[PDB]
Design a protein around this nucleic acid. Structure first.
Ligand SMILES: Nc1ncnc2c1ncn2[C@@H]1O[C@H](COP(=O)(O)OP(=O)(O)OP(=O)(O)O)[C@@H](O)[C@H]1O
Ligand SMILES: [Mg+2]
Length: 437
RNA sequence: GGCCCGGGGCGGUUCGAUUCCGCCCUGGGCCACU
């Protein structure tokens, strides 16, 4: 097991077989014919146009070029009209920039409308750079497409591929830029081992400098950070994965990790061993796009975690899961039950004005003096994390994300114990607690 | 939708709040959906 031989075997996993390629070329030819029959102006971009698409994950991107004077509404209406007329079956679901997704002779297709600008200067639609990325890449990625595939396969197998909010990882484009910059997958991995959270990679200048945060400047637009949505943690996982890989090569790094089935009876025993409070807030999943949902699940989950820490329940970690039916914010605290009494800091004995106001307070236990200042015993309105969250969630629902919050407002429940291990969250909990196997 | 920076109004908590928990108005960037 040496890098050399391993990467040789890995190609079998990332390179599309001749049949899959034929399927794409055949689908390409059909798109062309449907589009030419409409006399539409288009251009093939992305993975398929450059032959850097990962085996099994083929998607053809067709970009409909529109004059700059056109309305964003005209693009949407016209582009959606063209997309629907050109796909066997289609689906329209997006967060902001419109596009049609569908199928042609068996392969996934994305028909997207954009403005045909000159200079990726001041983009008008969110996707106007894409055509220029193609221009900039077609002449430089030639001969190294399999190197790109190795990188994509590597990141995909380890859950950090996509740049969408569900993953906060490396986009396909970023991968190609990295390949152009380092020359190959091995080189990229070798150098990535020394990346820092301040690393700046400028491919157009062929330079690596120190910066404010992780920044990969787009050759097409120097102000654009291609890795803007790559989370710090995901950057850290990659760098580490790169160290581990070079240290002990294995094509296991290209094989998707074990689905993991682990029985609920085992989870119960682990939680018992841990002596922690493991619970979850359950509510109905809002009918909105992944790209809108996840950031809200992140916020809600975080706002509640902070409530748990300032409330002294010693939160350990939080996680979340979304099924098609419901959503779950998961928590584990070191404190299952806290006392009713606690001490609140008061003024220094020195100024009677404030000491006076501090003592006029109707109180159950009579404040005391300790180290030069007054302190008072106070009673909590709740003593467990669950009682706390039920309280917080019912009252601060509006701060847990627009849609996620509104849903919790109309309904939510706190699941714990055995009734929790039944829900579709065992995987997430095991992951959250670091259960190995 | 989420994040970041900023205006102007407020409610609650607190001995004490610009500073802690939040709500309305609003201006400007950015990110995801290709
Ligand atoms: N998040 C993004 N950041 C930058 N460019 C992007 C992003 N998403 C899409 N693009 C542009 O649109 C093109 C199409 O992206 P798409 O989502 O189809 O993935 P891809 O790049 O085709 O690779 P793959 O299909 O193998 O994931 C990219 O090649 C790039 O030019
Ligand atoms: Mg594609």
């Amino acid at each position: 097991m040496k890098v050399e031989e391993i990467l040789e075997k890995a190609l079998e996993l990332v390179i599309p077989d001749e049949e899959e390629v034929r399927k794409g070329r055949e689908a390409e030819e059909e798109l062309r014919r449907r589009l030419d029959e409409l006399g539409v102006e288009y251009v093939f971009v992305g993975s398929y146009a450059r032959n850097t698409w990962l085996k099994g994950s083929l998607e053809i991107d067709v970009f409909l070029l529109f004059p700059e004077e056109f309305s964003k509404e005209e693009l949407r209406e016209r582009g959606l009209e063209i997309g629907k007329a050109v796909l066997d079956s289609y689906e329209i679901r997006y967060a902001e920039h419109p596009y049609v997704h569908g199928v042609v002779k068996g392969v996934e297709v994305d028909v997207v409308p954009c403005y045909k600008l000159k200079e990726p200067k001041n983009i008008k639609s969110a996707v106007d750079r894409t055509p220029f990325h193609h221009k900039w890449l077609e002449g430089r990625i030639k001969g190294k497409e399999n190197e790109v595939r190795l990188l994509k396969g590597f990141l995909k197998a380890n859950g950090i591929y996509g740049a969408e909010y569900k993953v906060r990882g490396f986009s396909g484009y970023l991968c190609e830029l990295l390949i152009v910059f380092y020359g190959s997958f091995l080189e990229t991995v070798k150098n990535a081992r020394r990346w820092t959270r301040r690393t700046v990679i400028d491919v157009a200048k062929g330079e690596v400098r120190k910066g404010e945060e992780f920044f990969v400047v787009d050759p097409v637009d120097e102000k654009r950070n291609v890795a803007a949505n790559l989370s710090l943690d995901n950057l850290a996982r990659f760098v580490h994965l790169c160290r581990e890989f070079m240290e002990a090569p294995s094509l296991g790094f290209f094989k998707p990790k074990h689905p993991l089935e682990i029985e609920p009876e085992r989870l119960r025993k682990i939680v018992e061993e841990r002596g922690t409070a493991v619970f979850a807030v359950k509510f109905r999943k809002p009918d909105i796009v992944d790209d809108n949902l996840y950031p809200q699940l992140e916020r809600a989950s975080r706002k509640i975690f902070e409530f748990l820490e300032r409330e002294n329940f010693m939160p350990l970690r939080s996680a979340f899961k979304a099924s098609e039916e419901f959503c779950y914010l998961l928590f584990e605290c070191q404190i299952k039950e806290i006392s009713r009494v606690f001490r609140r800091m008061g003024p220094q004995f020195e100024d009677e004005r404030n000491v006076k106001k501090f003592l006029s307070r109707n109180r159950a236990f009579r404040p005391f003096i300790e180290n030069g200042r007054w302190w008072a015993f106070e009673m909590r309105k709740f003593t467990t994390p669950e009682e706390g969250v039920r309280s917080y969630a019912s009252t601060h629902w509006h701060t847990l994300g627009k849609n996620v919050g509104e849903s919790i407002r109309e309904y939510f429940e706190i699941i714990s114990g055995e009734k929790l291990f039944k829900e579709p969250v065992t995987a997430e909990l095991c992951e959250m607690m670091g259960v190995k196997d």
